[PDB]
């Protein structure tokens with residue numbers, strides 16, 4: 405069964421590319437990562453850094469999570485990311501997305517032993 409850590413990796417990790425640089429990227433990735441089966445997941449971010457680097461964020465700058473929990477962490481360095489946002493004309497099962505590449509500080513929620521990312525909260 406899929407752990408929270410594994411779910412984070414499936415939903416939010418894409419180390420394979422340095423920067424998502426096809427306009428097709430989100431359309432393909434949201435589908436292949438199984439984020440378009442139940443519904444079109446409205447908003448989702450992929451991080452293009454090593455797993456070790458993203459995991460390291462759990463020991464970085466402690467910040468409040470959007471939900472008010474205290475277990476969020478902001479990366480000290482900017483990271484290569486791709487935001488996927490569902491278009492206004494996207495209709496399930498044909499989920500359509502805008503692909504936006506950025507370099508930003510990520511904010512993740514961490515839990516467990518080992519202490520690892522389980523939620524992507526925001527980028528700033």
Ligand SMILES: O=c1ccn([C@@H]2O[C@@H](CN3CCCC3)[C@H](O)[C@H]2O)c(=O)[nH]1
Nearest residue numbers: 415447448449450487523524525526527
């Ligand atoms: O910059 C972002 C912002 C949000 N998300 C996604 O939406 C978050 C929760 N949202 C769903 C509706 C309530 C808040 C999910 O935890 C995360 O998967 C993201 O991937 N990148």
